[PDB]
Each structure stands twice: as structure tokens, then as C-alpha cells.
């Protein structure tokens, strides 16, 4: 096997960039103005990493000066139907940056990380091809436990337990002690358990484990956003989760998709299977999916999968600008429709694990719920 921390550090971008420790979060419900870079179209999730390559001096200006102050710019969710009425989005904060003029056009490569969700109020258009967006921060809306309302005061003293050994009787125990006072309400322990952040996160962990070898956030907010970015879903569904204001509802709806969406199809010709859930695994620490930039500055949320069907390969394996040090890429396209689905990755050393695997772009895919037995998914 191979070093899973390598792909998330985007070493293919260049050796060292100036790094920025942290620190800027804007307090909730505020009204901010943030620049939005043009041509970047991606629905960006808190905690997700975003690599960029900027070519136009418009963009290259906007950033060079952005570094001095805030370092954060604005990324927009568009339903394609919007045609510019962008209505929600996400702050991304630059944590790494490099400005090369070697080739002899000036090129700016950056690594940003999604920070906050906002609502669009207005969009004003600096005639420099850049937007500056009037933007109200959305608070992550946090709920106490389901029991904190109905809890007998005498049993408060029992609500903290000794912490879990690092094995599932513990969860039966957990359920029995935490949701004891269900008897005062009109539902069972096992229901209140289906809205328990701690439980849901654990149920999600087990699926993520299948991806293998896992640690990660303890806060449900972060966890829910981390698995949100792992989910290969479609830009219209991705805006839905993002719009969702509870961690609990995020985790729940997220478990739904992971069970309900076994197959992954050619998005263009629709009724062709490329790959399955079975085949997804996390080459990157960050998930079975991350964002990667290519050399022409195009962004690819690519999904690492072990086999996959109904593709052609064109050309020969190349390590040029490869996102996965150790592997070469060959362009993959839909056997039927020719529409470019991703890449097949191939080892250059015979002592690496996965000798081959597919990396499939999310733009090229359509998650399906198998059958015509309730077959357009709605997140739950």
C-alpha cells in the first residue's frame, strides 16, 4: 500500500507554498462582503479542501491582494437553473499560496479550505470580471439532547457515563441510560436513538470503515461536513445538505444516501453503470473523494474506485501532473456516449498497492437507487 496523506497535501502543485496559520471566522448572522472568483463552479463544503490555479490577471490580482487582508473569498452554489441568481454558498480561506512566473505567464496556485455557509443578499459586479457578494453568515443551528427537555432532575446525575473502550453492548448500555426518560414521552429509546448525533456518527463510521483502515472530528458539525464531501452526489442534492442547518439532520440524511445509493452511472446517457459502492475506497485521507486541480486550472472532485465497467482508455499511462504520486493516468471515457468519465490510474512501481484503480470525476456521474421499485432520489 501507499501513503494516504500524500494526495490531500497536493504535492503535484509545487514543492513549497507560503503557509497561513488559520485564523479568521466571522461571527454568526453577520453581513459581510466577500469577493467571488469567476469560473470557479463547485459547491464547497466546510472543511473540504479546494485547490486552485489562476491564469487571468483579473483573478491573479484579486488573490494577490486577498492575501494581505482576509485571505477568504466566496464560493457559490448555483442550481444550473439559476443563471446567476446565486442564493447560498461557502467561505473558503486560503491556507497556502504560491505565485510562479516561471513558464512566463504568471500563475497562482492556492489551497483553500471551506469555512462558513452564507446566504446571498446582493451581488455587485466590480467591472474587473469579479463579483463582490453581500453575504449573511448562516449559524450552525445547535440543539440540546432530545431528553434535556423532559429529563427527570434526579436522573441528571447519571447522564454522564465512563467513556467507551476502543464493544457494542456499550451502545445498548448507552441507549438504555441516555434515553431512559423516553418513558415520560410518547416514543421508544430506539427512536430517540435515530436522532442522536453520537449514534448516527458511529453508524456512519462503520460505512467509512469499509472504505478502510481509519482520528477525525468529535464535533457532529464537522463530522457531518466531512462525510458530506465524501459523498459522490449531484450538484442539486449537494446544495440541499449544505442548506441543512442541523448536524443531526445532516448526519441522518447522509446515512440515507449511503444505504440508498449503491450504483454510480454515466451522468450523460444516464442508464449505464460505471461502478458501485462496493468499489469505493479512500486513497486520500480525506475520503473516497477530494477536489484536485489539473494544470489548466480545472477542478475535479475525483472518486477513487477499485474496479469499474464500460469504459474505454485512450492514449498511454502518464505521470504528468498526477494527483497521486506513484500513479500514472489514462483518460477514461464512456463506452456508449464517449463522454469523459475520469481516469484509470496505474502504478509505476511493482511494489505499490493498488496496481490499478479508477479515479472518476463527480461531474461525469449520476448516483442511482437500484430498481424501478421507488426509483430522482430525495435526501432523507
Amino acid at each position: 500500500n501507499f501513503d494516504t496523506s500524500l494526495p490531500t497535501s497536493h504535492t503535484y502543485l509545487g514543492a513549497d507554498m507560503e503557509e497561513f496559520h488559520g485564523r479568521t471566522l466571522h461571527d454568526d448572522d453577520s453581513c459581510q462582503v466577500i469577493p467571488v472568483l469567476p469560473q470557479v463552479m463547485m459547491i464547497l463544503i466546510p472543511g473540504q479542501t479546494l485547490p486552485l490555479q489562476l491564469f487571468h490577471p483579473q483573478e491573479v490580482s484579486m488573490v494577490r491582494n486577498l492575501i494581505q487582508k482576509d485571505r477568504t473569498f466566496a464560493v457559490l452554489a448555483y442550481s444550473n437553473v439559476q443563471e446567476r441568481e446565486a442564493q447560498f454558498g461557502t467561505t473558503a480561506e486560503i491556507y497556502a499560496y504560491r505565485e510562479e512566473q516561471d513558464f512566463g505567464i504568471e500563475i497562482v496556485k492556492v489551497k483553500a479550505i471551506g469555512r462558513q455557509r452564507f446566504k446571498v443578499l446582493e451581488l455587485r459586479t466590480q467591472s474587473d470580471g469579479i463579483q463582490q457578494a453581500k453575504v449573511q453568515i448562516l449559524p450552525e443551528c445547535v440543539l440540546p439532547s432530545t431528553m434535556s427537555a423532559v429529563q427527570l432532575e434526579s436522573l441528571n446525575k447519571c447522564q454522564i457515563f465512563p467513556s467507551k473502550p476502543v464493544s457494542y453492548k456499550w451502545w445498548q448500555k448507552y441507549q438504555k441510560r441516555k434515553f431512559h426518560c423516553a418513558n415520560l414521552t410518547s416514543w421508544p429509546r430506539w427512536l430517540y436513538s435515530l436522532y442522536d448525533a453520537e449514534t448516527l456518527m458511529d453508524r456512519i463510521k462503520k460505512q467509512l470503515r469499509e472504505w478502510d483502515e481509519n482520528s477525525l472530528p468529535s464535533n457532529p458539525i464537522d463530522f457531518s461536513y466531512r462525510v458530506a464531501a465524501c459523498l459522490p452526489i449531484d450538484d442539486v442534492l449537494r446544495i440541499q445538505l449544505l442548506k441543512i442547518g442541523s448536524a443531526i439532520q445532516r448526519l441522518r440524511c447522509e446515512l440515507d444516501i449511503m444505504n440508498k445509493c449503491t450504483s454510480l452511472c454515466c451522468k450523460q446517457c444516464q442508464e449505464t453503470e460505471i461502478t458501485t459502492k462496493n468499489e469505493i475506497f479512500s486513497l486520500s485521507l480525506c475520503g473516497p473523494m477530494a477536489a484536485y486541480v489539473n494544470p489548466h486550472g480545472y477542478v475535479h472532485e475525483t472518486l477513487t474506485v477499485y474496479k469499474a465497467c464500460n469504459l474505454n482508455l485512450i492514449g498511454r499511462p502518464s505521470t504528468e501532473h498526477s494527483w497521486f504520486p506513484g500513479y500514472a493516468w489514462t483518460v477514461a471515457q464512456c463506452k456508449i456516449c464517449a463522454s469523459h468519465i475520469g481516469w484509470k490510474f496505474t502504478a509505476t512501481k511493482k511494489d505499490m498497492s493498488p496496481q490499478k484503480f479508477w479515479g472518476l470525476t463527480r461531474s461525469a456521474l449520476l448516483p442511482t437507487i437500484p430498481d424501478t421499485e421507488d426509483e430522482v432520489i430525495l435526501c432523507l
Partner: protein, 1080 residues
């Protein structure tokens, strides 16, 4: 949409309970918190003294004596962090010495909950509200605004904290938990520096230690209770016992028996009461099993070995604990039971004229049905088996107070003498006893009178005997007679005579003739003798008034139809009414003119199809008793106000005032005479049907005249139960399947509606959890069915993947299982939907048609984002909700055979209950004990939030229904609660909402609020915090009636009252608020 919220049953459940000297230094009091209410009793070997209401959930309540104060003061801290210090004042005020809201801008509320403590020297109140901080209020004489300061805690997870006794500076002892384990520590609280100083001692305690007990100052020190171990600490003395007798469960409440601290009471989580003893200084500990009580939330030792058990899950108690333990068993015995409806976990409204409410109340051994009927109760002092009474009269064998009861049967009469409480048959000399008596009584000129069918009979009192008789001039039968102190008017069918009463003579006067055969008469005076007459004729079916001697009465109001049975002139408040009651059960009630003659301001109301009889009686003013299938008392406050009487039918009555039964009543039906005193006025009467297991749902099958109840019980592993339950003691019982650490076993009960016997217990499948229950007809099938929704629950499988919809039917004495459907998930709810069955299975809604092959055939299927936990309907609409407070409006489209989402509002907060108010409005209970309302009115697929209100209770159920007979306000929803409060919600016109909103504000200036908490702070929607809206607190409006006349005028001072507009008076409001009180 604008709504009125009012309480119909105050919360019953006990939060907390304390003793000490509050009312008076010499008295010993018990102070009890029942959520928003505070009861004050004086102990004797409990006399209620004062009960009041916080604008608050009482969350801490302690008594304490500051230096140089004459009795104890009372600290309350509410769930909204409203502090106050309170004094009793002698007629009685509870006054607020000090108050302040001790909220902080930052601060995560602690997982272990709010914890209030007062040190023994009364230096400070110590508050633990948030993790990391310990708040201190100095008790300095000059701290009226309870200003306070925080001390940082390194330790973030504090389990429990107490001040210690016998320290040279105030000292806290607490248990906390971190990664290295659980530990007890102490701090010295430096009053001056406002910091902790390294405490006298510390110590890794038991893993699950959770209770701190501070021992008073002979031994001083602390006791620490866990699961297995009880441990004592002071400095570096240390005792640790681990007795088996507390192995089985968890000690959750405690209390000191004596000042010494020799003895402590300890309460189990499942109903054991223990005594802990400290042996002497401190050398050993022994715990001893007193027995079983209601599951205790809090305990107080009172005196003479009597103990108050405050319950939440069950009825609260008084228990006597003997040092004689019986071989009945261990040593505790019940003295009193105090009703607790708490957990109202589900309910339904039944029955046919004035509806009554049945609940699933309690939990584990405390599980019960509660039946709640609005009512005037009657305390019985005698019942006598005495069939056939057809009239009743009190009488006085001596000139003062009745001593004689006269009863009539068909063509027969008989006399009872009363000596104290012993009734004995006698003869009255002068009274014929072989005819039926129509009236008798004491009369004018030291005399007596019997009016039979035959004759009208004047009798003397000193040497009793018949001084004059009157019969018809043609020796005929009397049909109907009416007599007062001085006069008689007797009818003979068609025509009728007026008679007087002088000594030895009853001499005739007027001998008139009527349209048709007179059916009822009256002569009740309004000033010694009645110058007027009430009549009712057989065939013109009319209530006529006539002049005396003359008889040309006039104002002869021909009501419609059926013959009149009774008629009466009487006086409520001071207005004068005429009442005429029909043989169909109707009752017409007109205005009267004693001096004018006109009968007017007509209203009419029905009481029950069996013909009605009307009597006057005193209980200090005058009311009317109305006998029929449903007996009714009448008053009054300038409405006449019918009030059902808590009794099976009363055929006849009279007032009865004896040396044995003073200011009492005599009630006769077909087979019994009853003598009783009668409560004024109507309260909620609760009948309690113990099940000894947890009831979970209830619904009503009217044709089977019985209830279905889902319930569950706890067995321990082979599986075999911990006690006899409803479900183990049914007459007939079934099981879903044969036998081919605690467990939960679900049952459907069939409870009789009359006897509340458990007729049948069905047991569902092993692992099968019964979720939903419902009674209804389906398709075109005349049968009514019980229908259960289940879900198959395994611990390994976190989401339910299979469940049943089962159709039962109860005919004869047998429960048949008629039809099943397996379904690939949980059936969280069901609801009858236009003769189809609508069920929510996970996040699908499914509508089933009921075939003739007698099976459910899926018609349609709708998937939502939301799990469908709540379902309700009206007309074509479906209201769907989930735990998270997300709501969906759905519409059945008959021409498409299909469902359609109409509106939705996802607004993430814990939701406990929903209801439809009408096509356009939706009620909900939501986190931090709130109510809210959604409204319907493209972008018409958005629901608007038009109402919020901080209730103070956690609603488990809404249900349409009332508890006052049929019929200002519009519609009615009742709601049931964890604390055992029952409420009512109803709509107001925008006119009344505006008026009552003004009123609230004006009543706020006038009413004294207990902790000096502002009403609007209290009602303000809480989790976020916003002002309350679109709700009117009827609890507040109704208190208008309790303030003094000058305060009433204060409140109405500058108001435009609204009809046809002008300066509003106290009287305009008194009548408005009274109409308002009449909706429960």
C-alpha cells in the same frame, strides 16, 4: 390565527419537596414544588395553607435561615434562571425580598443539570448552572437584586455538589469525572477573593458514584452514594460499604430524617425505600430495606415517622414507617395517596352529551388509566335500599330543622324519622298513608300539609291531627299540585283551584278552567306569598303565567312540539327566572317579571332525553337540581350555568337539613335513597384504574363499548415478569407466538368502559414493539376494528426493517386477529382516512384500501424527506411531522389516486406533538416546553410561523374535545403533559385577541408576581429567545376575577369596549372573563 391557552388541570407531578419553618417559626411546613406551582402545608400528626404560582419552572427550591431572621426564607431558581428570595406574611402574602435573573451571555448549560445549594451559615447561595463556572450570590442584607459572581472550575464535568457542615469557612464538596476517572474534591470558597482555595481533603471514588450528601455538624463530612458502594469522608477518616441490598438498582433521592443526621432516607429508581444509619464519633454504616413506595422523585421526613414521597411517575404519598415491620413484609405503610396524572403519555375524549377524557398515565408499577369528568361531586353519608320512590319531602315534626323524611310510592306514602344518622319508619298522625303524596311540607300557622291524589290535608303540629281536609267539589282525582308556605294551587287535569292556609282552615278562592290538561304548576314566591302562577298545558304545549286570585296571567309562550314535565320560578344572583323542562329532555329558561308579568330573554338548552324534574335548594345561596338521565345543578355571576352532577341518574330530590345531615341533600333513584352533602363548585373528578404496567396508547371503540390500550411490561431473563399486571391478569388472553437482563413485552389490552376490567390481553411478537393503535370502520364494511402498528426491534439493527399492520376485532368476549400486513419498516402512526387506512412506515406514507376479501390492499405510496412520526388529518389534508420539528402538509388527489405536497416548514427543533387546528393552522409542541403555530397563508408552499408561547410543560398529546356540554371562542384542543397538566387551546376572533392582549398588559401592571418575574419574560418563547405571540394566556386573563374591585377598575381604566364603542367598565370585563372561564 390567534389562540387562547388555558390550564384545565394544574400540574400534579412533584419536582422537589422540603421541610422547615416558613409560615411561622413554631410551625413545621412541607413545601412542595409541582412545576409552576408551590404548595405550602403545615404538618400535623397535612393542613393546606397557601398554594401559589411562579411565572417559572421551579428548578431549585431551598429553605434557609439567614442570621437574625425570625423564620426561614425560601430560595427559588427557575428553569429560565429567575432567582428570588421569598417570605411568608400573615390575610396572606408571599413576598419577594430579593430577585434577579442570573443568566450569563456565554455558558454551556451543564450536562448534570442545574444545582442549587445554600451553605449552613447562610453566607451564600452557590449555583452550578454552566460547565467551568460556579456562581455565588452573597447573602448580604443589602443584596435585593441578587447580583452575583462566578468562580472558574478547572473541572468541567461536575456530577454533584454540596456545601459541608462544620467548616471555619464555606466549603464545597463535589464529585467530578475526567479521563483518569471519578473523584471527590473540596474547595474553600473565599468570599473576599471570590475564588476557590485548596480544600480540606480529596479522593478515585466508585465509577458510578453520583450523589453527594452533606452530613450536619456532629460528624460533619460527606456521604457518597453510587451503584454498588456508599462511602463516607471527612478529612482522612474513610468508610466504604458495598451492601447487596442495594445491588439491584440505583439510589436517586435521599433526605435527612433527624437534625443529628443519625438516619437518612434513600429512594430507589424503581420504588425501594431504604434507611441509612450512621453509627457512633463515626464508626460504621448500615442500610435497611423499608419497602416499596411510589417511584420517588423526592423524599421528606415529616414527623411521628411519617414521610412524604413526592412522585413524578405515580401518585405522591404519605407513608408511615413502623419499627414494627410486619410479616405483611417490610416496615412502610401507606397513609394517603395524592392523585398524579403525570406522564400523560396519550389520551382520548369519549362520550353522549358532555365529553370526558381518558388518559394513559404513569409508568412501570404506577401505570394507570385516568378518567376525568367535569362535574359537581356528591359526598354520600347514607345509602338506603329503598326501591320505588316517586316523590320526596323534608319536614319538621316540631316547631326548627328537618327531622322527618316523607316518601311516596305509587298509591302509597310513608314516613321516615331521622335521629342523627339512623333513619327509622314512623307514622305521621293526620297523614293518610294509602294514597300517593304529591307534595307535603311545613306550612303557615304552626301547621303541616299533605297533598295526595284524593285530598288536600291540613294538619296541626302540637297534638298532630287533621284539622281540615279539602277535596274536589265533585270528589275527583287531583292530577297536579303546588304549594308554598301559605298557599295551594291544585289542578284536576283540565281546570284548577286556588287554596289558602289559615289555622284550622284551608279555604277555597278561585275555580278556573284551562285550554287543556295542565301538566305542571308553580307558586314559588318572589314578599311572603306568591302573587303569580306558572302553568304548563298538555296539548297547547305552552308555559303560561297567570295572576293570583284572578288567573288572567298572559305572556303565554307556546314552546314547540311533547308535554312539559316540570316548571319553576326561581332566583339566581338577584335576577328572576322562570324554568320549564320538557318530556323530551329540553329545558327552556326565560326571564321573569314578578311585577310586570312578561316572560322573555328566551334561551333553551337540552340536558338528556329522559323528562326532567326541577327543585329549589340552598348551598349559602339558592340553586336548582335537575333530575334526569343526567342530573344537573344550576347557577347563577349573571349567567345561568348548568353543571353536570357526578352521579348515575337521580329521579327525585329534596333539600335535607337535620341534626344528623346538616345542609345536606336527599337523592332518590329507582332502587336507592341517598343522603349527601354537595360540593360547590365543579372540579375535575379523576377515577384511577391501576394497570401496574406502562400504558402507551389508548383509543375508543364505542360500538364495543370498550377501550384498546397498548402497553408494555418488564420481564427478566429465562422470560418471567416482576409482578402481576393488567396484561397478565386478563379474563381472556392471547399471544402472537409460542416459545418455539430486562426485556419489554408489548400488549394490546381490551378494557371495558364501565367496569375498567381488562377483558383481553394480546401479546405481540418477541422483539415486536407496538407503536400505533386505532379504532375504525374501513371501506364499506360495517365492522369496527382495532388496528395496531408494530415495528420489529433488534439491538443489532439500529433502524427498524420490518413491522406489521394487524387488524383485530372484538366481538362477543373474544379478540380475533382478522388481517395482517408485513411492511418493510416501522409503523410509527396510523390514522383513519376517509374510510381508507393511512399509515406512516418509516419515511413513507401509505394509504390502504379495505377489500371484501378482508385484507389491506395498498392504493398509494408517498416518500418524504421526513420520517413520518406524527400523523393527523382533516378532510383531504394530511399533517406529517418528525422528531425534528419538520412539518409537511399533504393532499389526497382523488382524481389522481395519489398524494401531493401542499406546504412544508423545516425549522430544526425537537418536536413532541402536533395537531391540526383547521384547514390552515397547525399546532405543535416544541423544544424548551413551547407551543407554536404554523399557518397556510407559487410561494404558497411555505408555512408561516404565526404563534409562539412558552408553556412550561412538555406536551405529549393534542386531541380535539371539550369537558363542558355541547354549545365566543372557536373549536377546542386539549393537551396532555409530562407533568400531568391538562390544557386547552382554542381560536379567538382578531377582535378578542386585540382586547385580551391589552388586558394581559394591564393585568401585568396590577398582579403581584411571585419571584417578581415579568409575565412576558415567562411566556417568551425559549430554547434563542423571542417574545410570545399569537397566544393569550388564559391563566393570566382568568385571574382578573380574583383581584379586588379597585384593581378591576384600575385595569379597565382607559379602554374602548366593543359593541355597536365606549369607556369600558369592570362589569363589562367581569362578564367577558366569565364567558371565558366557561370553556372548561
Amino acid at each position: 390565527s390567534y389562540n387562547y391557552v388555558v390550564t384545565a388541570q394544574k400540574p400534579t407531578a412533584v419536582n422537589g419537596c422540603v421541610t422547615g419553618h416558613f409560615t411561622s417559626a413554631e410551625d413545621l411546613n412541607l413545601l412542595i414544588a409541582k412545576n409552576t406551582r408551590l404548595e405550602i402545608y403545615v404538618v400535623t400528626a397535612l393542613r393546606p395553607v397557601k398554594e401559589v404560582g411562579m411565572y417559572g419552572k421551579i428548578a431549585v427550591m431551598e429553605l434557609f435561615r439567614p442570621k437574625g431572621e425570625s423564620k426561614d426564607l425560601l430560595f427559588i431558581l427557575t428553569a429560565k434562571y429567575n432567582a428570588c428570595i421569598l417570605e411568608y406574611k400573615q390575610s396572606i402574602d408571599i413576598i419577594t425580598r430579593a430577585h434577579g435573573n442570573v443568566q450569563d451571555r456565554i455558558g454551556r448549560p451543564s450536562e448534570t443539570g442545574i444545582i442549587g445549594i445554600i451553605d449552613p451559615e447562610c453566607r451564600m447561595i452557590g449555583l452550578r448552572l454552566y460547565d467551568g463556572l460556579f456562581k455565588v450570590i452573597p447573602l448580604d442584607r443589602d443584596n435585593k437584586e441578587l447580583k452575583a459572581f462566578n468562580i472558574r472550575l478547572e473541572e468541567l464535568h461536575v456530577i454533584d455538589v454540596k456545601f459541608l457542615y462544620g467548616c471555619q469557612a464555606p466549603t464545597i464538596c463535589f464529585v467530578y469525572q475526567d479521563p483518569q476517572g471519578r473523584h471527590v474534591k473540596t474547595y474553600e470558597v473565599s468570599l473576599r477573593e471570590k475564588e476557590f482555595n485548596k480544600g480540606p481533603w480529596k479522593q478515585n471514588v466508585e465509577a458510578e458514584a453520583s450523589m453527594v450528601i452533606a452530613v450536619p455538624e456532629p460528624f460533619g463530612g460527606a456521604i457518597i452514594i453510587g451503584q454498588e458502594s456508599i462511602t463516607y469522608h471527612n478529612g482522612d477518616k474513610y468508610l466504604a460499604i458495598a451492601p447487596p441490598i442495594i445491588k439491584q438498582s440505583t439510589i436517586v433521592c435521599h433526605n435527612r430524617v433527624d437534625p443529628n443526621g443519625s438516619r437518612y432516607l434513600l429512594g430507589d429508581m424503581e420504588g425501594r425505600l431504604f434507611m441509612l444509619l450512621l453509627e457512633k464519633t463515626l464508626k460504621d454504616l448500615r442500610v435497611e430495606l423499608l419497602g416499596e413506595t411510589s417511584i420517588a422523585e423526592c423524599l421528606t421526613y415529616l414527623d411521628n415517622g411519617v414521610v412524604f414521597v413526592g412522585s413524578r411517575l405515580g401518585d405522591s404519598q404519605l407513608v408511615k414507617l413502623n419499627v414494627d415491620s410486619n410479616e405483611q413484609g417490610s416496615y412502610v405503610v401507606a397513609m394517603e395517596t395524592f392523585t398524579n396524572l403525570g406522564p400523560i403519555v396519550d389520551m382520548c375524549v369519549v362520550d353522549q352529551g358532555q365529553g370526558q377524557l381518558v388518559t394513559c398515565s404513569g409508568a412501570f408499577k404506577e401505570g394507570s388509566l385516568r378518567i376525568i369528568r367535569n362535574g359537581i361531586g356528591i359526598h354520600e353519608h347514607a345509602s338506603i335500599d329503598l326501591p320505588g320512590i316517586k316523590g320526596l319531602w323534608p319536614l319538621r315534626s316540631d316547631p326548627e330543622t328537618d327531622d322527618t323524611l316523607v316518601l311516596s310510592f305509587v298509591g302509597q306514602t310513608r314516613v321516615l324519622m331521622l335521629n342523627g344518622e339512623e333513619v327509622e319508619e314512623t307514622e305521621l298522625m293526620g297523614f293518610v298513608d294509602d294514597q300517593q303524596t304529591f307534595f307535603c311540607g311545613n306550612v303557615a300557622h304552626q301547621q303541616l300539609i299533605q297533598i295526595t291524589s284524593a285530598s288536600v290535608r291540613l294538619v296541626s303540629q302540637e297534638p298532630k291531627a287533621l284539622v281540615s281536609e279539602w277535596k274536589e267539589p265533585q270528589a275527583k282525582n287531583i292530577s297536579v299540585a303546588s304549594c308554598n308556605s301559605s298557599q295551594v294551587v291544585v289542578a284536576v287535569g283540565r281546570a284548577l283551584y286556588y287554596l289558602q292556609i289559615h289555622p284550622q282552615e284551608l279555604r277555597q278562592i278561585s275555580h278556573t278552567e284551562m285550554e287543556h290538561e295542565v301538566a305542571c304548576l308553580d307558586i314559588t314566591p318572589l314578599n311572603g306569598l306568591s302573587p303569580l302562577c306558572a302553568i304548563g298545558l298538555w296539548t297547547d304545549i305552552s308555559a303560561r303565567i297567570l295572576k293570583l286570585p284572578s288567573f288572567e296571567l298572559l305572556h303565554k309562550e307556546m314552546l314547540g312540539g311533547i308535554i312539559p314535565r316540570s316548571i319553576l320560578m326561581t332566583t339566581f344572583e338577584s335576577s328572576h327566572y322562570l324554568l320549564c323542562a320538557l318530556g323530551d329532555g329540553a329545558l327552556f329558561y326565560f326571564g321573569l317579571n314578578i311585577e310586570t308579568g312578561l316572560l322573555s330573554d328566551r334561551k333553551k338548552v337540552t340536558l338528556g332525553t329522559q323528562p326532567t324534574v326541577l327543585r329549589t335548594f340552598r348551598s349559602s345561596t339558592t340553586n336548582v337540581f335537575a333530575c334526569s338521565d343526567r342530573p344537573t345543578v344550576i347557577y347563577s355571576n349573571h349567567k345561568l350555568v348548568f353543571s353536570n352532577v357526578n352521579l348515575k341518574e337521580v329521579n327525585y330530590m329534596c333539600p335535607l337539613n337535620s341534626d344528623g345531615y346538616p345542609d345536606s341533600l336527599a337523592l332518590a333513584n329507582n332502587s336507592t335513597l341517598t343522603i349527601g352533602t354537595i360540593d360547590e363548585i365543579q372540579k375535575l373528578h379523576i377515577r384511577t384504574v391501576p394497570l401496574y404496567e406502562s400504558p402507551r396508547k389508548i383509543c375508543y371503540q364505542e360500538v364495543s363499548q370498550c377501550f384498546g390500550v397498548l402497553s408494555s411490561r418488564i420481564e427478566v431473563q429465562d422470560t418471567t415478569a416482576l409482578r402481576p399486571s393488567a396484561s397478565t391478569q386478563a379474563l381472556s388472553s392471547s399471544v402472537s407466538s409460542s416459545k418455539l437482563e430486562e426485556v419489554e413485552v408489548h400488549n394490546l389490552l381490551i378494557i371495558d368502559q364501565h367496569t375498567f376490567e381488562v377483558l383481553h390481553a394480546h401479546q405481540f411478537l418477541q422483539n415486536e414493539y407496538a407503536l400505533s393503535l386505532v379504532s375504525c370502520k374501513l371501506g364499506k364494511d360495517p365492522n369496527t376494528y382495532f388496528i395496531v402498528g408494530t415495528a420489529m426491534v433488534y439491538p443489532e439493527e439500529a433502524e427498524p426493517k420490518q413491522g406489521r399492520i394487524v387488524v383485530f376485532q372484538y366481538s362477543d368476549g373474544k379478540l380475533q386477529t382478522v388481517a395482517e400486513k408485513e411492511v418493510k419498516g416501522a409503523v410509527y402512526s396510523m390514522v383513519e382516512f376517509n374510510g381508507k387506512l393511512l399509515a406512516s412506515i418509516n419515511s413513507t406514507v401509505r394509504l390502504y384500501e379495505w377489500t371484501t376479501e378482508k385484507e389491506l390492499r395498498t392504493e398509494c405510496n408517498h416518500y418524504n424527506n421526513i420520517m413520518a412520526l406524527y400523523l393527523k388529518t382533516k378532510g383531504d389534508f394530511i399533517l406529517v411531522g418528525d422528531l425534528m420539528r419538520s412539518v409537511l402538509l399533504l393532499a389526497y388527489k382523488p382524481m389522481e389516486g395519489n398524494f401531493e405536497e401542499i406546504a412544508r416548514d423545516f425549522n430544526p427543533n425537537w418536536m413532541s406533538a402536533v395537531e391540526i387546528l383547521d384547514d390552515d393552522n397547525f399546532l405543535g409542541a416544541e423544544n424548551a416546553f413551547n407551543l407554536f403555530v404554523c399557518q397556510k397563508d407559487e410561494e404558497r408552499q411555505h408555512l408561516q410561523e404565526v404563534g409562539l408561547f412558552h408553556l412550561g410543560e412538555f406536551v405529549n398529546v393534542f386531541c380535539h374535545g371539550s369537558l363542558v356540554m355541547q354549545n365566543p371562542t372557536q373549536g377546542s384542543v386539549l393537551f396532555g403533559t409530562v407533568n400531568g397538566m391538562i390544557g386547552l387551546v382554542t381560536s379567538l376572533s382578531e377582535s378578542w385577541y386585540n382586547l385580551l392582549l391589552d388586558m394581559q398588559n394591564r393585568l401585568n401592571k396590577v398582579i403581584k408576581s411571585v419571584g417578581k418575574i415579568e409575565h412576558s419574560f415567562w411566556r417568551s418563547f425559549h430554547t434563542k429567545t423571542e417574545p410570545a405571540t399569537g397566544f393569550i394566556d388564559g391563566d393570566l386573563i382568568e385571574s382578573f376575577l380574583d383581584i379586588s374591585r379597585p384593581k378591576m377598575q384600575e385595569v379597565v381604566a382607559n379602554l374602548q369596549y366593543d359593541d355597536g364603542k365606549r369607556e369600558a367598565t369592570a362589569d363589562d370585563l367581569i362578564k367577558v372573563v366569565e364567558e371565558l372561564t366557561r370553556i372548561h
